[PDB]
Design a protein around this ligand. Structure first.
Ligand code: ZNH
Ligand SMILES: [Fe+2]
Ligand SMILES: [Fe+2]
Length: 153
């Protein structure tokens, strides 16, 4: 459980992400795929894209990153009160996409890196700490939902 001030830091930087959701979602995917290529393989419909510029040019990839980050933003705005939003996400990710919690860790790392690289003046140590705690809470709770579904993430 985060403090009110930690939530405010998370939502303040999130409002910066919302100025360009598509571009942040591209950058986070490209960082994730470069850092951890197995994660590209899980995105079965995007495995063909060869370079960063091919990734940025893909409308399908851009639209997917907006869907992904819109769901995360809706979860963060609930300030931990997110069972209703988490539930369907855990269902699809445990049963259809088969995303292990470790890959949620990898993308949390990519989110922190991209937020820091785009917004350093609004994402210092305290905001980083608050976003880390927010994403750790998301991962803990989605891992409990995975188990409810019979999936060990
Ligand atoms: C932050 C965190 C996160 C979030 C919020 C999300 C969200 C999301 C959403 C909303 C969607 C749509 C719906 C469904 O479910 O299906 C998706 C899809 C999705 N997903 Zn995911 N995710 C994520 C992570 C992820 C990761 C990490 C991975 C890998 C690795 C993934 C993989 C995925 C896939 C593969 C899909 C499908 C895509 C297409 O369309 O193709 N995922 N996703
Ligand atoms: Fe592989
Ligand atoms: Fe994705």
């Amino acid at each position: 459980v985060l403090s009110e001030g930690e939530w405010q830091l998370v939502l303040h930087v999130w409002a910066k992400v919302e100025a360009d959701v598509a571009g942040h979602g591209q950058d986070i995917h490209i960082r994730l795929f470069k850092s951890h290529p197995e994660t590209l393989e899980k995105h079965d419909r995007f495995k063909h894209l060869k370079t960063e510029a091919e990734m940025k040019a893909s409308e399908d990839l851009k639209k997917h990153g907006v869907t992904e980050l819109t769901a995360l933003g809706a979860i963060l705005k609930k300030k931990g009160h997110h069972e209703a939003e988490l539930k369907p996400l855990a269902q699809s990710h445990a049963t259809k996409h088969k995303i292990p919690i470790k890959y949620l860790e990898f993308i949390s790392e990519a989110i922190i890196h991209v937020l820091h690289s785009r917004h350093p003046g609004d994402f210092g140590a305290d905001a980083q700490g608050a976003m880390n705690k927010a994403l750790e809470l998301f991962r803990k709770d989605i891992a409990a939902k995975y188990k409810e579904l019979g999936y060990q993430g």
